[PDB]
Amino acid sequence: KNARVIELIAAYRNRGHLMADIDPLRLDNTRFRSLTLWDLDREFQRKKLRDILSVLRDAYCRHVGVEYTHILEPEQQRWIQERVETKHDKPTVAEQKYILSKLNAAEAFETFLQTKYVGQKRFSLEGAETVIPMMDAVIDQCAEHGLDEVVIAMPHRGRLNVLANIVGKPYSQIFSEFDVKYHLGATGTYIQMFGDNDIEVSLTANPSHLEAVDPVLEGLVRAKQDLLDTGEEGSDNRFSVVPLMLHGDAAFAGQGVVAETLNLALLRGYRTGGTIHIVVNNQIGFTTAPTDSRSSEYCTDVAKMIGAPIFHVNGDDPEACAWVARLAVDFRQAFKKDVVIDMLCYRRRGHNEGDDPSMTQPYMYDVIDTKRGSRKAYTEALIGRGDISMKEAEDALRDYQGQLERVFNEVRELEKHLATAVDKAMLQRIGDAHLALPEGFTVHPRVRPVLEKRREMAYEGRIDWAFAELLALGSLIAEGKLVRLSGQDTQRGTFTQRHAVIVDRKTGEEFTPLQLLATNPDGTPTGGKFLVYNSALSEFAAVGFEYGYSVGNPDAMVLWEAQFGDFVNGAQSIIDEFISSGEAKWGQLSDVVLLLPHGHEGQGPDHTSGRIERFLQLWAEGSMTIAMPSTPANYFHLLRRHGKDGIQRPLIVFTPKSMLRNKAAVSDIRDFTESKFRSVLEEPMYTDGEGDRNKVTRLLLTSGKIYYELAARKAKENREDVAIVRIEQLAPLPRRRLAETLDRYPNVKEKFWVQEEPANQGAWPSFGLTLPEILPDHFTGLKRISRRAMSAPSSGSSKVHAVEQQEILDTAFG
Amino acid sequence: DKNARVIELIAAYRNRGHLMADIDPLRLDNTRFLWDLDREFKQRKKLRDILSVLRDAYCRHVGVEYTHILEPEQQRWIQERVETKHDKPTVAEQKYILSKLNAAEAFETFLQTKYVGQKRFSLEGAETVIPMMDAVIDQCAEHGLDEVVIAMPHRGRLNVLANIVGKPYSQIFSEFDVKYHLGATGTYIQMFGDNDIEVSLTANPSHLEAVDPVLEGLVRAKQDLLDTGEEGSDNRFSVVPLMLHGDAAFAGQGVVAETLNLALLRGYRTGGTIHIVVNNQIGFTTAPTDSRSSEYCTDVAKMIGAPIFHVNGDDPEACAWVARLAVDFRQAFKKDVVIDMLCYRRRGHNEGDDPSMTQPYMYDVIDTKRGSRKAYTEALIGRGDISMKEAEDALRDYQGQLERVFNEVRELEKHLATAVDKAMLQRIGDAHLALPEGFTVHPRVRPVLEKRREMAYEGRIDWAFAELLALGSLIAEGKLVRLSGQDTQRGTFTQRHAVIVDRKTGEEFTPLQLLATNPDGTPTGGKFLVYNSALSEFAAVGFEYGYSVGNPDAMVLWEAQFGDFVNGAQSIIDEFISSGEAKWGQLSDVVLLLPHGHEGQGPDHTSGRIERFLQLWAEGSMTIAMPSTPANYFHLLRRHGKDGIQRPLIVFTPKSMLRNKAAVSDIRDFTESKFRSVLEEPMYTDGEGDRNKVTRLLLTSGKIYYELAARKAKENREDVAIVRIEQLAPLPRRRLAETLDRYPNVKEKFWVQEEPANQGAWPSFGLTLPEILPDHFTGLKRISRRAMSAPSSGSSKVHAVEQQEILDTAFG
Ligand SMILES: CCOP(=O)(O)[C@@](O)(CCC(=O)O)[C@H]1SC(CCOP(=O)(O)OP(=O)(O)O)=C(C)N1Cc1cnc(C)nc1N
Ligand SMILES: CCOP(=O)(O)[C@@](O)(CCC(=O)O)[C@H]1SC(CCOP(=O)(O)OP(=O)(O)O)=C(C)N1Cc1cnc(C)nc1N
Ligand SMILES: [Ca+2]
Ligand SMILES: [Ca+2]
Ligand SMILES: [Mg+2]
Ligand SMILES: [Mg+2]
Fold this sequence. Notes:
- The structure is a homodimer.
- Chain A has about 800 residues and is an alpha/beta fold.
- Chain A folds into 4 domains: about 1-60, Helix Hairpins; about 65-415, 3-Layer(aba) Sandwich (Rossmann fold), CATH 3.40.50.970; about 415-600 and about 625-680, Rossmann fold, CATH 3.40.50.12470; about 600-625 and about 680-814, Multifunctional 2-oxoglutarate metabolism enzyme, C-terminal domain (Rossmann fold).
- Chain A is about 40% helix and about 15% strand.
- The first copy, chain A, is built from 30 helices and 22 strands.
- In chain A, the strands form 4 sheets. Chain A has an 8-stranded mixed sheet. Chain A has a 7-stranded mixed sheet with strand order 12-9-13-14-16-15-20, with helices on both faces.
- In chain A, helix 5 (about 130-145) packs parallel to helix 12 (about 320-335).
- The longest helix of chain A has 27 residues, at about 390-415.
- Chains A and B meet through helix 1, helix 9, helix 10, helix 11 and helix 20 of A and helix 1, helix 9, helix 10, helix 11 and helix 20 of B.
- The structure holds ligand ZP1 (2 copies), calcium ion (2 copies) and magnesium ion (2 copies).
- Chain B: Pathway: Carbohydrate metabolism; tricarboxylic acid cycle; succinate from 2-oxoglutarate (transferase route): step 1/2; Carbohydrate metabolism; tricarboxylic acid cycle; succinyl-CoA from 2-oxoglutarate (dehydrogenase route): step 1/1.
- Chain B: Belongs to the 2-oxoacid dehydrogenase family. Kgd subfamily.
- Chain B: Its EC number is 2.2.1.5, 4.1.1.71, 1.2.4.2, 2.3.1.61.
- Chain B: One of its GO terms (molecular function) is dihydrolipoyllysine-residue succinyltransferase activity.
C-alpha cells in the first residue's frame, strides 16, 4: 500500500499535466474522461493520503500543467516541486486589481485599434490579452531581482499593445503619421507599481519571417551583457540583461531556427543566462489545426532538447499566468537556463480581413463565439470568489471605459497637430605576444613554428594572410576595441592557419596570444578584449547571433566566419532580412563582418563559392561593403578601416583557401606601416618596378587569387602588351580610382573582365551591366573571360576544373 | 520502508540509469562512474536478482531513454524487452558480426593505403556502424518489408556501398569525389533467413542534414506507389527511411527539428525513421561542449517522444541487438527511433589535421585504442565463444578480404498537346457540386462552387479555377497529383478551396478526387493528395523535392505562403532543385508556386526574388515562368506534367490579380490553344489593332500588363504595344524574335517591371537580351523602381507613388 502511494506521487509529477485544465476552449472532450477510499485517512515527513493527493491535484491538475521530470539536474527538479507542491498565498486585492487594470488596458487597446483604424484584424491580441499581465509580471520580477534590462523579441500579434502597455511608449509616438511600426525597435523604462526599482525595456526590430529574430535577440542581449560586465564574460554571474522571447504555437514547432537558438542556451560563446519564452498558443496557425502543424503533444516540446522546464497555463486564469511568469524569472535567476511558458488561449477573430475562420475550423469558432473575454471572465471570477464588490467591479468597468477614452482622445489630439597604418613597434608587439607563453605552458610541436614564424614576419616582413588578419585584430584590441570572432573551428582555423587560441599539449589549457594586447606596456588596460570562439554546427543561428551582437554593441568589431562560403546559404533569411536590408527598412544599423572562404581549386560545388553574385545582387548604395582582397596588407587595412571608420555597415569578405600559403601572396612591413586600403591595385612592376604602362594594349580586370596565375603567365611569356588590374572592393564600385588607374594605360585597345566563376556567377552578372554604364568611356566594349554558365558553382571533378582553369589563362593571353 | 526503497531504486534505474551506463569506448569522463540482497521482494524475486536485471538492462553498454515517452504502452513495450534475460547470440551470428567487421576494416586500410586524399571519409573507430546497419536491414527483411532507403553524410559512404548496398568494387572504383554524393541501388539477401529486401542510397550535397527531409519525401513517394502507409491499403509502411548523422550536425542543424516535426503528420509521415548517429564525440576540431547545450547529441529527438538508445560502439553485439529492437519498435508504433552509437575518429578530420593540436587528451587515449575488430576478436576468445584456430581463421578472413579489394581494383585498372475537351471542363465544374449525401457547405464556400460550374460551361474562368482545371484533367488522365504548402487546402487568399469542410461535422470533401473515377465507374489510376503543411519552408520544400525524385510520374507542387518566405529553403533550392541534375544525374519535376507582386504590403509580402532563380538558371536546369492569364497557367501546368521531362518548374503566382476581372479566360483558350511563352495584346491577334502604327514597344511580365493595357486604352495609344514574356527561363528566343518582327516601325524598346532595378528580370534580361537577339534588343532601356536593398518600401503610400511613376514613364 505504501509503495502504490510513491508511484501515485510520481504519476502526478510526471503526467499530471495531461489532466490539467489548461485549454480555455475545452475542445478535447476526451481529456478528463480518460490504494482505496479507506486509505485516504491513513498516514504515509508523515502526511495523510487525502492531504498528499490534494497537494498533487492543486499543483499539477488545475490551471497549470508542469513539465519538469525530464530535467537531468536533481537540484532543479527539487527546486520546482518545492515551489509548486505548497499552499500558495492568495494575491492581495491590490495585486488582483492591478492584474485587472493590465487586462483593462489590453482589451481597451484592441477595441480602439479595431474600431478606429482599417485593416488591423491581423494584429489582434483578442482572446490572448492575458499575455499583457503575464509579460508585466516577467519584467516586474526582473526589476525585483535588481536586473538592468529586458529585451523582447516577438512576432506582430499584440505588438503595439506591447509598445503601449509593456514598453510604455506614449500613443502620440505610436500612432504618429499612421505597418512598418509592427517591425521597428523601441526603448523605454518600466517603473514598479508596488516596488521601488525600475528597469529598461526594449523591443528589437524584426522581419515578417517568424522566429528568424530568435538568435538575433540572443546576440543583442549577449553584447549588452558583455558591455555591463555581467555573465559569461563578466565579473558577476547575474546575467543582468534578460531575453524575453514571444512566439506563436505553429511557428515555435515548425521553424528549425528555434532548435538552433535553444542549442546556444548554455554554450560559453553564446549563453545569455537563460531566456524567458512565452508562446501565445491560440491553438491555430492561420487555417491550420495543431494536428497538421506538429508531431508532438505540445507546441513547446522542442524545448525538452535542453531540459528546460515547461509550464502550460490557462490563458483565462490571469493569476496563474502572473504566478508562472514570476516563478520562471526565479528559475532563470537560480539556474541560468531557459524557461518556457505555453499560454493556452484563442484567436477571437479571423487571422485577417478575408478570413471567416468557420470555413476551415467550424467547431473551434462555434465555441469561440460563446466565449466572453479574459477581462470579463476575471471580473466575474473575482466577484464570485468574494474578492471584489459590485462597486469595485463597476469601478473596474469605469477604469476600462476611461482607458478606452484616453487612447481615443490622445490620438484625436495627435491627428489635429581615417588612417589605418600602424607603427612597426605595433607589429613587433603582436609578433612577440605569440611567444609570450604562460609559465610551464607546453606548445604542440606543429604549432610552435607558426608562433616563431609570426615573430619573424613581424620584424622581417613576408607577412602572410593569416598573420595580417591577427595584426589587424590585435592592433584594434591595443587601441581599446572589443573584438568578437567566431565560426566553425575558428579558434584554430579550418585551414590550420589561424591558431587564435593554442592548447597546452599536456593539460588542454587554452592560451590566447592576442588577449595580451588588451594590456598596455605600462600594465594598464587598453579597454580592448579578444572574444574568440568555436561555434556550434549552425549557420542560421550563428549568423543571426553575430548580426544581433553588432546591433547590441555598435563599438564592437564582430566577425563571423563560414567554414566555406558555400554554407552561408544556410543563413539566407538573416542575410536577406537583417544584414542586407535592416538599415533601409528599420533604421537599424549593423557593422557585422562575414568572412567567406572562396575560390576555384577543384574541391567541388560545395567547397568553391560564397556566391559573390548573390551579395552583389542584394547590394544597393550604402547598404554593405563587399570585398575580395588579393594581398595580406590590403586585408589588414580593410579590417582596420571597417573598425575605425565610424560607419555602421556590414562587410562581406571573400577570403582565401590555398592562397593563404601562396608564397607570392605575402606583404612587406611598409605595406602595413606606410599605406592604406587600396580599392584598386596595379601590378608592382608599374608602381615599384621598371614596367612600361604605354606598351599595354590588352587590359585584364580581375579580383582575387586568379591574379597570381595571370601574373605568373605574363612573366613566363614576358607579355609587356598585357596588364592585370585588380578590383579589391567589389561594392561600392571604386568608380574614381578605377577611372584614374585605367587613364594610365593610354594604348589599351581591348578590356576583359577575367574570373574563375561561371558566366552567370561571380562579379560578371553585375559588373557586365554596371561598368559600361558608370564608366562608358572606359568600359564600352568590355568582354568576359570565365567558366561557362553552370547550374552549380563548379564541376564535381578536380580534373574538369584544372582543364577549365588552364582554358581561362589561355583565353586571357590568346 | 525497505520494500518501498526497492520501488524507488527500480524507477531510478529506469529514469536515470543511462547516465551511469558504460557507453563511451574512450572513457574520457573520469567522473561519470549488503544483507538485503538475498531477501525476496514483491512475482517474488531476490533483491540481487532484481538489481542485476536493472544493471544489465540500464547500466551496461546500452543507455536507454524512454521514460519521457507519453504513451504508457510504448514505455511498457521497451521495459519488457530490455528487463529480461536475453539469449546470447549463436557462434554463427557472432562470426557473422565479426565477418562484417573484417570487411569494414579491410576496406578502410585499402582506401587509406591505395588512394591519396581519402582521410576525411575514414570510418576507423566507427566500423561497428556496418554490422549495426546490416542488423537494421536484416530485421526489416525479417518483417517482410519492401525496401530500406538510406541518407547519410560522406563518412564511411563507400564502405556502406560495398558492405551494405552490396555494390561491387568494379562499379565503386570505376573512373576514380562525386562518388561520395551519388545515389545507389541494390538488393540485400539475408544470411540466415530466406527473405531479400531492396537497399538504396539517396544523393546529397556537402550541407550536413539538408538531405533529411528529402529522404522522408522520397520514402513517402515510394510508400504511396506501393499502396502502403498513410495513403495506402495496409499499415506496414514497408519502405523504411534509415537516416545517418554526425553528432555535431545532429545537434546544431535546425532542419533536424523540422524533419522530426514531420514524423507523425498525415501529409508527411513515413511510419517511423531509424536514426543512427555516428557519435565520435567530435566535430572537426570542436568538442561537444561547444556544439550543444544538452547532455546528448540526440536530445532534439525528445521533441516527438522518440526512444533513444546510447550504445557503446566497441560492443558490436549490443549495437546489433539495439538495431533489431529499433526496427521492432518502429514496426509496432510507426514512430522514430534514435540510435546514438558512441565511437571515436581514429585519424584526423582531413589531410592537414594533426588532431592532437586541438584535442590532445582525446587523441592520446585514441592512440592507445585498438580497433573494434581486434577488440571483438579478443573478447570472443576471453568469453570462450571462439577457439585459437577460429580466431586465427577470422584473422585470415580479414587478410582475404584485404587482398580481394586490392586484386579486384587492380583487375579494374587494367581494363504534346495540352488542350482538353469542353466536356472535361464541365466535368471538373460539376464535381464542385457533386457533394456527398447530407454534406453542409459553409455559406461563403457554396457561391465559389456554383461559380465554378458556371465558369466551366460559360467561360470567364479565373486563375484559381484554371489551376484546378489543370490538376483535375491530369487526375482524369491517370496522373497522381500532390499539392501542399501553408494553408494550401483553402488557399492563403481564400481562392482555392481544394478541400471544403462540413459546417456541422468538420468532415473534409475533396471535389477533384471524383476525377480519379471515370464516368463508367472504373479508376483512372489518378489521385489528388492535398495537404496543409507545417509552418516550415526548409523541410517542406526538401520533402516535395524528395517526393518528385521518389515518383517521377507524380505531379508535385509546393506552395509558399508568399514567395518572400522561400529564402527559408535556400539550401534546398541551391543544393538540390537547381543543381541536382548536373551534379548527380538526379532528376526532379518539382513545382514551386511563389505568390509574387508589388501591392504595397511591404518587403516580406512582395517578392519571390525572380532575379535569384534567374541567376541560378543554366540551360535546361529549370523552367521559370510568370503567367498573366488563367489559361496560360493551366497550359503551363499541363505541359509540365505531360512533357516527359524531369525538370523543376518555378512559377511566380498572383495575389490581387486572382480577383482582377480583366485577368479571366475564355473556354476556347483551354480547348483550342497551348502554352504561349510570349503573349501579344488581344487587339492584334483577335481584334482590329494595327501593329504598323506602333513606334514604342514595352516588354513586360506579370500583372503590370493589366495596368499598362488600361493606360493605353485610356489615352488611345495606337503608337504603343505591350508584349509579355510568360516564360522567363529558358528565354523563348524564337517566338520573341518572330513576335517583334511583326512591329516594323518600332523606334524604341523598354523592359518594364515593378521590381527595383537590381531585382526582377532586368539584371539578367538587360545583359542577356542584347546578346541573344542583337538586331532586336540593342539599345534596350529599363523602366522599373530604383535599386533597393529590400524587395520594396515599407509604405503602401510610397508604393502607390512609385507604381504611378512607372506607368507615367512608360507613356511619357
Ligand atoms: C496571410 C498569411 O500570412 P501573414 O498573416 O501575413 C504572416 O506573414 C504574419 C507575420 C508578419 O507578416 O509579420 C504569417 S502568420 C502565419 C501563421 C502563424 O501561426 P502561429 O505561429 O501559430 O502564430 P498566430 O496563430 O499568432 O498567427 C504564417 C504562416 N505567416 C507567413 C509566414 C510563413 N513562414 C514564415 C517563416 N514566416 C511567416 N511570416
Ligand atoms: C574542412 C571541414 O569541412 P568538410 O570536412 O569539408 C565538410 O564539408 C564535410 C562534408 C562534405 O563536404 O561532404 C563538413 S564536416 C564538419 C564537421 C562535422 O561534424 P559531425 O557532424 O560531428 O560529423 P563527423 O564527426 O563525422 O565529421 C563540418 C562543419 N563541415 C562543413 C559544413 C558546415 N555546415 C554544413 C551545413 N555542412 C557542412 N558540410
Ligand atoms: Ca564600421
Ligand atoms: Ca515534366
Ligand atoms: Mg497560433
Ligand atoms: Mg562527429
